[PDB]
Coordinates of C-alpha atoms in Angstrom, one line a residue:
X2 CA 116.3 76.3 127.8
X3 CA 114.3 79.2 126.3
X4 CA 113.6 78.9 122.5
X5 CA 116.8 80.2 120.8
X6 CA 116.3 82.9 118.2
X7 CA 115.8 81.7 114.5
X8 CA 118.7 84.1 113.7
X9 CA 120.9 86.7 115.1
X10 CA 120.8 89.0 112.0
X11 CA 118.5 89.6 109.1
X12 CA 118.4 91.4 106.0
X13 CA 115.6 94.1 105.3
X14 CA 114.7 96.8 102.8
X15 CA 115.2 99.5 105.5
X16 CA 116.2 99.6 109.3
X17 CA 112.7 99.2 110.6
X18 CA 111.9 96.3 108.0
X19 CA 108.7 98.2 107.3
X20 CA 108.9 98.2 103.5
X21 CA 108.5 94.9 101.6
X22 CA 111.5 93.5 99.8
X23 CA 109.5 91.4 97.3
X24 CA 106.3 89.9 96.2
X25 CA 106.4 86.2 95.9
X26 CA 104.0 83.3 95.1
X27 CA 103.7 79.9 97.0
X28 CA 104.9 76.8 95.0
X29 CA 104.5 74.3 97.8
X30 CA 102.1 74.1 100.9
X31 CA 103.6 74.8 104.4
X32 CA 101.9 74.4 107.6
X33 CA 103.4 76.4 110.6
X34 CA 105.0 74.1 113.1
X35 CA 104.7 76.7 115.8
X36 CA 103.3 80.3 116.4
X37 CA 106.5 81.7 114.8
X38 CA 105.8 80.5 111.3
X39 CA 103.3 81.4 108.7
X40 CA 100.9 78.9 107.3
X41 CA 100.9 79.0 103.4
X42 CA 99.1 77.1 100.6
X43 CA 100.2 76.8 96.9
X44 CA 99.2 79.8 95.0
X45 CA 99.0 82.3 97.8
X46 CA 100.8 85.6 97.5
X47 CA 103.4 86.5 100.0
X48 CA 105.0 89.9 100.7
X49 CA 108.5 89.4 101.9
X50 CA 109.7 91.8 104.5
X51 CA 112.9 90.1 105.9
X52 CA 115.4 87.5 104.8
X53 CA 117.3 85.9 108.0
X54 CA 121.0 85.5 107.9
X55 CA 123.4 82.9 109.0
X56 CA 121.9 80.0 111.2
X57 CA 118.3 80.9 110.4
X58 CA 118.9 81.7 106.5
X59 CA 116.6 79.0 105.2
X60 CA 113.8 81.3 106.4
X61 CA 112.3 84.6 105.3
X62 CA 109.7 86.7 107.2
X63 CA 106.6 88.3 105.6
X64 CA 102.8 88.4 105.5
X65 CA 100.1 86.5 103.4
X66 CA 97.8 88.3 100.8
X67 CA 94.1 88.2 101.6
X68 CA 91.1 87.7 99.3
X69 CA 90.2 91.4 98.4
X70 CA 92.3 93.6 96.2
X71 CA 94.9 95.4 98.5
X72 CA 94.5 93.3 101.5
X73 CA 97.6 92.1 103.3
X74 CA 97.3 90.3 106.6
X75 CA 98.8 92.3 109.6
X76 CA 100.6 89.3 111.0
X77 CA 104.1 88.7 110.2
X78 CA 105.6 85.1 110.4
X79 CA 108.6 83.0 109.1
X80 CA 108.7 80.4 106.4
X81 CA 111.2 78.5 104.3
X82 CA 112.2 80.6 101.4
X83 CA 112.2 77.6 99.1
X84 CA 108.4 77.4 99.1
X85 CA 107.8 80.6 97.3
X86 CA 108.9 82.0 93.7
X87 CA 109.9 85.7 94.1
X88 CA 108.1 87.5 91.3
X89 CA 109.0 91.1 91.7
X90 CA 111.8 92.8 93.7
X91 CA 110.3 95.8 95.4
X92 CA 113.4 97.0 97.2
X93 CA 116.9 95.5 97.6
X94 CA 117.0 93.6 100.9
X95 CA 120.4 95.0 101.8
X96 CA 120.0 96.6 105.1
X97 CA 121.7 94.3 107.5
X98 CA 120.3 94.5 111.1
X99 CA 120.3 92.7 114.3
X100 CA 117.2 90.7 115.3
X101 CA 115.5 92.0 118.2
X102 CA 113.6 90.3 121.2
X103 CA 110.4 91.1 119.5
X104 CA 111.2 89.2 116.2
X105 CA 110.4 85.7 117.4
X106 CA 107.9 86.5 120.1
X107 CA 104.5 85.6 118.4

């Protein structure tokens, strides 16, 4: 019935998933199929905050960098990991936590 969660568990840099795991650059375009996902275009910078596990492991969560130095969109959304190239690890994405009800809400 209701939209099933994309995953039951995820990997983060910390329990709250508030620190980014990595900085990545998009290699492919990706238009979000619904509000849970992030729309990205080749060349954009994405800060990765979560990596889903198990059934949702193709997808990562993060935010897109803006146009002025230092700008990161507030909105978090999911995207296929394969569309980006991770360029710098900021923190190990080792903290294994459960996804909550708010993770896939939009």
